[PDB]
């Protein structure tokens, strides 16, 4: 049901630029749009004028600001920033009714971090201390939140991809999803919730034990699927796979859709392809199933996405009436990354309390009249622990 109404629909944005929630820092409260990123553990915000920022954190205006006299540097797969550490009172307008003092990195320098038009000025690293900068002694935001309040050690995300391009004004006007803090709202999904164990508390790491393209087993040593790790990251657009897995999957995805030929630039995620209005040939593209280690011994389940998920909508160059997309699956040299496009198909529950991650068909996932995303199980699978890379 509508368990947490005050938090439903509190996100905005899209896979390409990121999903963000509204937050306030300081006294008096300073409103800022914060990118929700489960792929990192640092809470940082722009603290100085930037051509891509309409606003930013102003420490000298916060009576509750506290200087920690320490610098911090944080590099991501793509983009990085430098800033000064401190703490302050923080709140989430559309979230639990509480205020907590959290560590905040005031970004003073950055390169390829902020996105023009994204509308967010900071980032919320929801992962664990293990990968926090400068070190694990810097308590991550969610941790501070649980220690200081009675909010359950859990949060769930519902990222809603529109299924078509969204221009600046409409991205700002539309609801991009919900981030339920401290609970699970049943109106955000259908079917049952299946859980996969969080292998280790640093990134939100899971283990993929099998991969299928339209039912066909990619048939690779499952260790490849998790080389050198597999994480869930709302801050990554595409579904990224380690080189060898990417090469096999693309070869299989190309064979399944062979009735049409596409340029290499398309499969490299660099160039888009367009089709006459409403004629995208979805049925020629295969569904992709990722089996994940289950909670019960030798048991697994699978999540299945449609091309409506891995083909990312983008406005045509000549702003035509054509429906154009980009291949939202790309190579990776740092393991698998189940990004926004994968998440847009499901309601993902980060059960930190029970050290597990649950998936369920999203009530807002894009599909057609012939297929829908899915989460099914159980499946008898042996030696899944071995699928994990060491």
């Amino acid at each position: 049901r509508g368990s947490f109404v005050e938090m439903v629909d509190n996100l905005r944005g899209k896979s390409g630029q990121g999903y963000y929630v509204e937050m306030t820092v300081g006294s008096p409260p300073q409103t800022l749009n914060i990118l929700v990123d489960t792929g990192s553990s640092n809470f940082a915000v722009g603290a100085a004028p930037h051509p891509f920022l309409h606003r930013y954190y102003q420490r000298q205006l916060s009576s509750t600001y506290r200087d920690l006299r320490k610098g911090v540097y944080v590099p991501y797969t793509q983009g990085k920033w430098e800033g000064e550490l401190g703490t302050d009172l923080v709140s989430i307008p559309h979230g639990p009714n509480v205020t907590v003092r959290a560590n905040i990195a005031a970004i003073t320098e950055s390169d390829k971090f902020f996105i023009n038009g994204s509308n967010w000025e900071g980032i919320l690293g929801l992962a664990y201390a293990e990968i926090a900068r400068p070190d694990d002694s810097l308590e991550p935001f969610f941790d501070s939140l649980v220690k200081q309040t009675h909010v359950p050690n859990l949060f769930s995300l519902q990222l809603c991809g529109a299924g078509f391009p969204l221009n600046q004004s409409e991205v700002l006007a539309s609801v991009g999803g919900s981030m339920i803090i401290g609970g699970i709202d049943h109106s955000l999904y259908t079917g049952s919730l299946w859980y996969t164990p969080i292998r280790r508390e640093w990134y939100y790491e899971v283990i993929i034990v099998r991969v299928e393209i339209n039912g066909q087993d990619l048939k690779m040593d499952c260790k490849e699927y998790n080389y050198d790790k597999s994480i869930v990251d709302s801050g990554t657009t595409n579904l990224r796979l380690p080189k060898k897995v990417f090469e096999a999957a693309v070869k299989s995805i190309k064979a399944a859709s062979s009735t049409e030929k596409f340029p290499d630039g398309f499969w490299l995620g660099e160039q888009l392809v367009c089709w006459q209005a409403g004629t995208t040939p979805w049925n020629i593209f295969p569904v992709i199933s990722l089996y994940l280690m289950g909670e019960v011994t030798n048991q697994s389940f699978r999540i299945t996405i449609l091309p409506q998920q891995y083909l990312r909508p983008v406005e045509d160059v000549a702003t035509s009436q054509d429906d154009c997309y980009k291949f939202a699956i790309s190579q990776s040299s740092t393991g698998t990354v189940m990004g926004a496009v994968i998440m847009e198909g499901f309601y993902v529950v980060f059960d930190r309390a029970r050290k597990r991650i649950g998936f369920a068909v999203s009530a807002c996932h894009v599909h057609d009249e012939f297929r829908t995303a899915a989460v099914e199980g159980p499946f008898v699978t042996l030696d899944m622990e071995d699928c994990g890379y060491n």
Binding site: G39, P75, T77, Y203, G235, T236, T237
Partner: peptide
């Protein structure tokens, strides 16, 4: 696109 941490 966004590709958010290196460890």
């Amino acid at each position: 696109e966004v590709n958010x941490a290196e460890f």
